[PDB]
Design a protein around this ligand. Sequence first.
Ligand SMILES: CCCCOc1nc(N)c2c(n1)N(Cc1cccc(CN3CCCC3)c1)CC(=O)N2
Ligand SMILES: CCCCOc1nc(N)c2c(n1)N(Cc1cccc(CN3CCCC3)c1)CC(=O)N2
Ligand SMILES: *[C@@H]1O[C@H](CO)[C@@H](O[C@@H]2O[C@H](CO)[C@@H](O)[C@H](O)[C@H]2NC(C)=O)[C@H](O)[C@H]1NC(C)=O
Ligand SMILES: *[C@@H]1O[C@H](CO)[C@@H](O[C@@H]2O[C@H](CO)[C@@H](O)[C@H](O)[C@H]2NC(C)=O)[C@H](O)[C@H]1NC(C)=O
Ligand SMILES: *[C@@H]1O[C@H](CO)[C@@H](O)[C@H](O)[C@H]1NC(C)=O
Ligand SMILES: *[C@@H]1O[C@H](CO)[C@@H](O)[C@H](O)[C@H]1NC(C)=O
Ligand SMILES: *[C@@H]1O[C@H](CO)[C@@H](O)[C@H](O)[C@H]1NC(C)=O
Ligand SMILES: *[C@@H]1O[C@H](CO)[C@@H](O)[C@H](O)[C@H]1NC(C)=O
Ligand SMILES: *[C@@H]1O[C@H](CO)[C@@H](O)[C@H](O)[C@H]1NC(C)=O
Ligand SMILES: *[C@@H]1O[C@H](CO)[C@@H](O)[C@H](O)[C@H]1NC(C)=O
Ligand SMILES: *[C@@H]1O[C@H](CO)[C@@H](O)[C@H](O)[C@H]1NC(C)=O
Ligand SMILES: *[C@@H]1O[C@H](CO)[C@@H](O)[C@H](O)[C@H]1NC(C)=O
Ligand SMILES: *[C@@H]1O[C@H](CO)[C@@H](O)[C@H](O)[C@H]1NC(C)=O
Ligand SMILES: *[C@@H]1O[C@H](CO)[C@@H](O)[C@H](O)[C@H]1NC(C)=O
Ligand SMILES: *[C@@H]1O[C@H](CO)[C@@H](O)[C@H](O)[C@H]1NC(C)=O
Ligand SMILES: *[C@@H]1O[C@H](CO)[C@@H](O)[C@H](O)[C@H]1NC(C)=O
Lengths: 772, 772
Amino acid sequence: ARWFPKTLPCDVTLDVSKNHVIVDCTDKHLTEIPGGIPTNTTNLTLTINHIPDISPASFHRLVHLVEIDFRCNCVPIRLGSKSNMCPRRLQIKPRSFSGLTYLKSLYLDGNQLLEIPQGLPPSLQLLSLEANNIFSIRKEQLTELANIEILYLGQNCYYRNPCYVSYSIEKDAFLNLTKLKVLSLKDNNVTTVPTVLPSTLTELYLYNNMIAEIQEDDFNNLNQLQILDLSGNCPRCYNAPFPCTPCKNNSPLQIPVNAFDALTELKVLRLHSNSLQHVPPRWFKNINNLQELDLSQNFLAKEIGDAKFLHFLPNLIQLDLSFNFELQVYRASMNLSQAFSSLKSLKILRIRGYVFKELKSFQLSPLHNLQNLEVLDLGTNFIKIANLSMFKQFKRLKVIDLSVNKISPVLEQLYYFRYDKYARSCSCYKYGQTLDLSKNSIFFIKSSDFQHLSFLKCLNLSGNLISQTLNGSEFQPLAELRYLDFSNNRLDLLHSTAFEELRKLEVLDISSNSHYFQSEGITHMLNFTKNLKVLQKLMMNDNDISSSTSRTMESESLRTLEFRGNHLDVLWRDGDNRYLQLFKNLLKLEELDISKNSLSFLPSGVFDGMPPNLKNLSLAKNGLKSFIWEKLRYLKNLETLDLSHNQLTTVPERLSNCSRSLKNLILKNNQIRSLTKYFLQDAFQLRYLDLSSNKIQMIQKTSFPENVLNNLKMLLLHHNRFLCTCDAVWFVWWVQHTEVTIPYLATDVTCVGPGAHKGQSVISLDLYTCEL
Amino acid sequence: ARWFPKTLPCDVTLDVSKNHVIVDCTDKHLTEIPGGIPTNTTNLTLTINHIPDISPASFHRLVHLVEIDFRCNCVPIRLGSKSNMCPRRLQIKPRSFSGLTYLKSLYLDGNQLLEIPQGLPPSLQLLSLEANNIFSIRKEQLTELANIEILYLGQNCYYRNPCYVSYSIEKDAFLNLTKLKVLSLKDNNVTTVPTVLPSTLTELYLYNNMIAEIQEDDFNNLNQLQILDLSGNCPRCYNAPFPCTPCKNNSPLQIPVNAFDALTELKVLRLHSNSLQHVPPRWFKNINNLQELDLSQNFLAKEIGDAKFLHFLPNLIQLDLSFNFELQVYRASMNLSQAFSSLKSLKILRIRGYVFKELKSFQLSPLHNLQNLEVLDLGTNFIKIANLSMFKQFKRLKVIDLSVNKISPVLEQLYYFRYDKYARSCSCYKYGQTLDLSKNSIFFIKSSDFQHLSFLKCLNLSGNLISQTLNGSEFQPLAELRYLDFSNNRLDLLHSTAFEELRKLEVLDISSNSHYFQSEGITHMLNFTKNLKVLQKLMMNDNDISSSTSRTMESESLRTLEFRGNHLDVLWRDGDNRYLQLFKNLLKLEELDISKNSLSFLPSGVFDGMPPNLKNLSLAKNGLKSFIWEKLRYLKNLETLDLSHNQLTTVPERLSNCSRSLKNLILKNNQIRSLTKYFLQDAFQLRYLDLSSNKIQMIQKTSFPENVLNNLKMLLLHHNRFLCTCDAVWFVWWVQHTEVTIPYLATDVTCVGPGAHKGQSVISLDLYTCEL
Ligand SMILES: CCCCOc1nc(N)c2c(n1)N(Cc1cccc(CN3CCCC3)c1)CC(=O)N2
Ligand SMILES: CCCCOc1nc(N)c2c(n1)N(Cc1cccc(CN3CCCC3)c1)CC(=O)N2
Ligand SMILES: *[C@@H]1O[C@H](CO)[C@@H](O[C@@H]2O[C@H](CO)[C@@H](O)[C@H](O)[C@H]2NC(C)=O)[C@H](O)[C@H]1NC(C)=O
Ligand SMILES: *[C@@H]1O[C@H](CO)[C@@H](O[C@@H]2O[C@H](CO)[C@@H](O)[C@H](O)[C@H]2NC(C)=O)[C@H](O)[C@H]1NC(C)=O
Ligand SMILES: *[C@@H]1O[C@H](CO)[C@@H](O)[C@H](O)[C@H]1NC(C)=O
Ligand SMILES: *[C@@H]1O[C@H](CO)[C@@H](O)[C@H](O)[C@H]1NC(C)=O
Ligand SMILES: *[C@@H]1O[C@H](CO)[C@@H](O)[C@H](O)[C@H]1NC(C)=O
Ligand SMILES: *[C@@H]1O[C@H](CO)[C@@H](O)[C@H](O)[C@H]1NC(C)=O
Ligand SMILES: *[C@@H]1O[C@H](CO)[C@@H](O)[C@H](O)[C@H]1NC(C)=O
Ligand SMILES: *[C@@H]1O[C@H](CO)[C@@H](O)[C@H](O)[C@H]1NC(C)=O
Ligand SMILES: *[C@@H]1O[C@H](CO)[C@@H](O)[C@H](O)[C@H]1NC(C)=O
Ligand SMILES: *[C@@H]1O[C@H](CO)[C@@H](O)[C@H](O)[C@H]1NC(C)=O
Ligand SMILES: *[C@@H]1O[C@H](CO)[C@@H](O)[C@H](O)[C@H]1NC(C)=O
Ligand SMILES: *[C@@H]1O[C@H](CO)[C@@H](O)[C@H](O)[C@H]1NC(C)=O
Ligand SMILES: *[C@@H]1O[C@H](CO)[C@@H](O)[C@H](O)[C@H]1NC(C)=O
Ligand SMILES: *[C@@H]1O[C@H](CO)[C@@H](O)[C@H](O)[C@H]1NC(C)=O
């Protein structure tokens, strides 16, 4: 097909519209810029390599470069690999960028640079220098950046990349950058707000620094500023998972009451972890367009009961007052000021970590007529008592979050306490109203616990203590529930009527409920599915199921069953036929996951026992040592077969004689050492074949006919044990000249022998001596 | 040293007493009996190989054979490997055994034999034929066995190995085996007790068969019988994990009241799973010596409340009445007959699976004066209520077992429900009185829950629901407790006074209490250890610990800390020094397990931070990609270093220059491709080195000086990538002639190249062409 095999170890994509030729060499274990990069290349990415310097030669020919991403070719010691440390900082010779007359974006993050690289072209709008060793900014070094719009200078002086002195910025260093819109000086040991900043700024990031005081003039001219982040100046250090130095005398970040008066466009104000004890209403007199306010991680517990400043925030969309609790206090209740009722535009209110024992209905009354409220987050509060019926007054809300409490009858999980949540490195809400009770202390449930909550569409009970023999009487109010997460409980399936009161239930997760499955002699009614007549998806992973009182599960609605992490191996013990139809009467089942079931073999009858419409079958992670491929004939709708991570040593003699429907065959991470002579012959339906991470030496055209190979959307071959003799001449020619997508040709499709060619990439192999 | 390298692929042992030459070829992937077996061999084991036949050649030279163990060279299809099925039943040619005049024991189990092998010598005392296909016993085929004493014939006809007919035994088949003491016909589809059996029998196993009736004379002459097992005839089939057919009308096994009259010597009577509804006192009128009685898995719930037969069993040591509940009855209480008080010698009483809601003190009153009672097993009863103080009247007991119940304020776990618990295939009790409350529904504890139980030495609270912030007030009565198992709960370490009331605690297990360690911002006091002044061993595995409020753990007593399965990688994030002395002040710590902590590297300061007497360090399973060996100099008492299952690529240049104390170095399952030139030079302390499962090609004599090798107790080298060229000539010679124990030379110390010698064992290698 192809006339010229691409030997460049980089992905090349054309977007003809934009006008972009994209060359991506991310993580290609390079020590030089590869030769032969297309001269029309507009976007060149060299992230995560070990290229020790940049020079005039680097980009000589590439004069139509609009973006260079050269990040993390020498990342700071404590941020980088300890097994492959960078020996010596990136070296940028004079001249390296001045020729790139069209250069618009330059990323040099994480290269241990000591200075702002000079000689940059006047086309540059974005320059990024995060995680280098530049901790003194001089106006003379910024004159080259006349037209710069976005300047990232952060993470150059902080605990994971220390500079051991205070950051230094010359007076007015940035003022003549008359188009600068975004300046980030985060994580830099900065001690004062630099002045004067250009009035064109829209985004200013000064968080995680050592700024002890804001001067009243600091933001005087910033009448276009939309985002201001001063978080982490005078941090609140309790249970911080990074080294944390508070301001002395337990001072807050000192902010004069008129400090924001010029910020008439401000939309985002972030004051997280500033040790604030009060927030004066005067701050917000001239900020009427403010939409997002973050006051988490201060000392504002008392202020929350007063909060006069809220009267000045009628357009506020999101408010975060999380983790303002007083150390060593376990409040009886939450005192919300009535001033909360002035937040008529509020959609998201987060008050994690206030820390109180009992939530009462009236305590939430200031929120009753907030008609746009979508999310109420009272997580991580150690609440012991809450009558869930109080949320009958919150039908309009999308999410009510009571997660991580101690009640008894999405944000990345390290969110409020990580150092820099925006650090750049080298779910059932969609069903409707959601009550999240996950990780609480609920040991017993009864119908009245859910009185007045029939509007609920998703209930999350994951990670509670529920241990009772559910009999269809526990969720009677929840007539609209579509999704129940019951994972990480101790479900006892004594009654096959469990969950039957949830007549609209579409998704049920009872994964990680193994407790009562682990003890012999206990009744388990796995046929409880029969009563749920709109159930689509059932998850019962990691339940350690090795016994069942019922011989069959039944449903006319289920399409998806996850049954991973169980013991079908003992249920299907050789010589016991009783459970071989366990899934047969799930008549509409399309996807079955029975990975991780210790199935070292499949007894005969397993495939005959599958329900008739099975599309997606996983048998991964089973230690399967053998597989009668012909039995796939029973699976007449089989489309995806996942046999990854097993011990298989052979493929079928003729795949077409095993399944006429099979489209996607995943055989990665097995022990296959050779293919059968006619393996893929006439398997015209095959579209995806993964044989990576096996031990294949040879592939001949008889096993891999071109009439089948050319229809494949993807063919995975990497990490095998290819022998590159003259017997491999067809295989080597084909991979070099095929348009079928094969990943990791640059990385991991290599000869292991013979001697000469060991370790060499198959794509670069010259086998001319075989035709001499 | 050795003049003749041992090439036989079998372990050879001398017992001089003796008179034994033991050759063990278990699981050596043999297809023939290997040549060169010592002529003096007395015990020859060939179990689990694929030797297709036996002939007079097999054992020709071996005329001092006292035992042949030839098990499982052709296991029945459903009991054996599906990846290596046996093609053809074992073939025993004539005369193969008649020559072995001293043969006393012959095991031919699991070979698919169709008939009892003939021509066996008259010395034979033990013949074992389990799991073959012999299901018709003819007196003519037994005449060869005149002197036989032990005869195993079971598992020849049952669901895992069917014969599709009833077992057949000719009348008097065994009568003339006048020295037969042990006859086993279990798992055989037998329909009647064979008669007449020889009066010399001491043990008769007829369990798991189809015997519906015992005739009153079936055991008439067995006046020497000591063990009788009739279990699994008319089985009780509820929740059976094997195919189970009951007797029709669910009759019990019918046993005449005088059936045991001749059995005056009976010590063990097993009547498990016989669907008994009554046990007539008249059964035991002439059985005065009975010590063990198993009546589990019958229908004796009512009988337990009456039980007149117990008055006839004053010497009974063990009684098992487990799993006698009435189906689908949930009794309020346990009705134990007063007759239990006559069991004057009883030490073990097991009544699992009676199934009742409430245990009260007076219900155990029939046991108050059983002065020899040592264990009371009331597990798996679904008990909801029990005042634990009632056990103040059972201080003499060694174990009180309430495991697997529903209380709220060792037997292999497939024990009562396994088909054949004695099937042959091819803990804190030692601390004193134990109350086992594991796997219950205890969500809250207070001191009064343990009133009057101060005698307890071990409490098992594993797998409950305990979620509270322990503060030293929960276990106050337990003044003698030496061992607390608190694993699989939800420990909340808000207070560092947790557990301090247990002043005699020597072992604390708080493993798998990860729940509150998985949510950010929560207080965790890992320094609670300071208060436990005799704590020796602390297990906190799998707690997912990634954050801690205390920077240091402290103890003057702790010897052993298990900290596996946590996140020291994030606690020790590079650039965060705060936790680098977390373990330093555990001043007597000798053993530290910090495997499975995702430590792909160790930040500097980890070794300096270890406590001074650390002897045994595990860093296994961490993904370690690098290791500064010199840092071991800080660990001046280090004796064992376990780095198994990591990604290490190098060993230190000179181990002795890194650690003068190190005795045991485990490096198995790494990526090591070569040893340093002088690796072991002068490591006079080294006694144990494991380099197995790496990628070593070559080992030169400089790396392995013989003054060091000769002190090694063991050196593990198997599963590497040895190159057997003339450069390997020293290593090959050394391996062949050394006395150092190296395991698996027969199995897995092999050449991977060059071509000629691929797959060949190094021990068998002739490299004479290298000296031509
Ligand atoms: C030892 C095997 C006993 C039978 O199996 C079994 N399995 C379980 N999961 C459980 C269980 N019993 N029981 C005991 C039990 C036994 C029979 C009938 C009933 C229910 N009736 C209807 C109303 C009250 C009585 C409960 C309690 C439990 O929570 N769970
Ligand atoms: C958001 C973090 C809150 C602080 O941390 C924290 N961690 C825990 N594990 C828990 C916890 N609080 N609390 C709240 C809390 C906080 C401070 C003091 C006290 C108890 N005092 C003793 C005498 C008067 C009150 C309780 C309850 C709990 O069970 N557990
Ligand atoms: C931030 O700046 C401070 C100084 O303002 C740095 O602290 C100094 O560090 C050196 C050596 O570590 C000490 O000798 C000085 O006494 C320190 N001064 C103070 C005021 O502490 C600090 O290291 C800088 N932070 C980072 C991450 O580099
Ligand atoms: C135990 O013996 C019974 C009969 O004594 C066997 O049952 C017969 O099995 C054959 C073949 O499956 C059937 O055609 C007969 O109808 C059965 N007879 C009766 C009376 O049921 C049984 O197969 C044997 N069990 C094993 C494990 O081999
Ligand atoms: C190419 O560069 C331009 C300018 O920096 C950018 O807008 C575009 O997204 C880039 N395309 C990539 C990186 O694929
Ligand atoms: C919870 O509140 C409802 C009112 O919505 C009330 O009817 C119910 O009794 C309350 N439950 C408890 C336990 O107080
Ligand atoms: C329920 O909560 C758990 C625990 O916080 C979370 O991981 C899971 O995604 C939630 N389930 C759904 C369906 O949102
Ligand atoms: C489920 O299990 C058995 C039949 O398999 C039966 O006793 C029980 O009534 C069944 N219940 C349902 C709802 O199918
Ligand atoms: C050797 O055989 C005799 C007789 O069968 C037996 O008693 C002895 O235990 C055997 N020894 C070993 C080590 O197998
Ligand atoms: C116990 O049961 C036996 C027989 O079922 C009966 O004789 C006796 O009265 C019962 N006692 C109690 C206390 O239930
Ligand atoms: C438990 O029994 C003890 C007597 O041993 C008694 O003092 C105590 O009151 C009982 N506790 C309960 C909760 O009944
Ligand atoms: C406690 O009981 C569990 C079973 O529930 C067992 O796994 C564990 O070993 C026991 N602990 C001790 C110390 O015996
Ligand atoms: C420990 O907790 C109990 C109740 O949980 C409380 O009564 C007691 O005062 C606490 N102990 C101390 C020393 O505060
Ligand atoms: C544990 O550490 C805390 C400080 O983090 C301290 O207040 C407490 O008293 C310490 N407890 C012990 C037993 O050392
Ligand atoms: C070292 O501790 C491990 C537990 O990780 C133990 O299994 C091993 O036997 C110990 N080794 C020595 C030599 O004490
Ligand atoms: C390591 O070897 C050098 C040179 O022989 C020696 O000076 C040094 O003291 C040694 N270190 C240790 C810890 O033995």
